[PDB]
Write a protein that binds this ligand. Sequence first.
Ligand SMILES: CCCCCCOCCOCCOCCn1cc(CN(Cc2c[nH]nn2)Cc2cn[nH]n2)nn1
Ligand SMILES: [Cl-]
Length: 294
Amino acid sequence: IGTGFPFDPHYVEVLGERMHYVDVGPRDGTPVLFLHGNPTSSYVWRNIIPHVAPTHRCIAPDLIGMGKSDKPDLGYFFDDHVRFMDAFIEALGLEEVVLVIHDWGSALGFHWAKRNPERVKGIAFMEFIRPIPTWDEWPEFARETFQAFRTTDVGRKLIIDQNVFIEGTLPCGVVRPLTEVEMDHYREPFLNPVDREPLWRFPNELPIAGEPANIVALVEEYMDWLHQSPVPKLLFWGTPGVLIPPAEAARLAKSLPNCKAVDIGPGLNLLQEDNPDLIGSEIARWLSTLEISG
Ligand SMILES: CCCCCCOCCOCCOCCn1cc(CN(Cc2c[nH]nn2)Cc2cn[nH]n2)nn1
Ligand SMILES: [Cl-]
């Protein structure tokens, strides 16, 4: 599994800030937009993009406050990420897109799709944000940690002062051991403790046990839209998963229209780090089938 990040930096100005993105592949055709989540960056897509770049433009931004994107003094609410991602997409002048989305990247991508349904030609997704009705529906091994994350004093001490989301939670989201080179890539944007605000706000935005109520409502609405939409769908899942256990992936594979589901084997949250070749190869082949009438 490759540790390098061999992508030239591209930058675009967005609402007075600068955002970084990977941009490879041909200039024409429908672009494939890759959206990472917490606590990653476009680095998480590094071994998936090469399977897709021969046939499609691949665009992989770093969320505001993350990766190589700028770090304004925001709260980094989900609302803030929505604002910047909306403006990022318009700044590149994208028209129709295929979405490849993960974790908080999936909340951004589904929320954007719901509002721009004519511009989404397909959605590939994995370990994505859905409403978690009670804490019993959160994986037992991660319950006490995320419950502590969702406090102001203790959670900020863990995530901001002690960098637990990077040093502890992140490697706990991968079945295989991350190498020191891979850890340093994930560590790079957050070496300065003050810059770890998004890492703490994100778990406090998670729609768990009905709170925060604004995020729960928004996530419910895009899951409603997703069950209504004929858009082609590709769902990757692993065992045991974190956000999406296998029983839930099996349920969604039938309840979502026009949905193909792919078992990646063992996996927790960063499925991309456990089986990038399967995910990248299946995305590339699925993209081809989107051009077949039938
Ligand atoms: C869905 C969004 C992305 C999901 C990412 C993948 O999710 C995997 C789930 O990961 C759960 C495990 O989390 C990290 C495990 N872990 C435990 C500790 C030990 N202490 C944490 C703690 C304290 N009290 N309780 N816990 C650190 C400490 C120092 N001083 N005081 N405490 N460090 N790390
Ligand atoms: Cl999170």
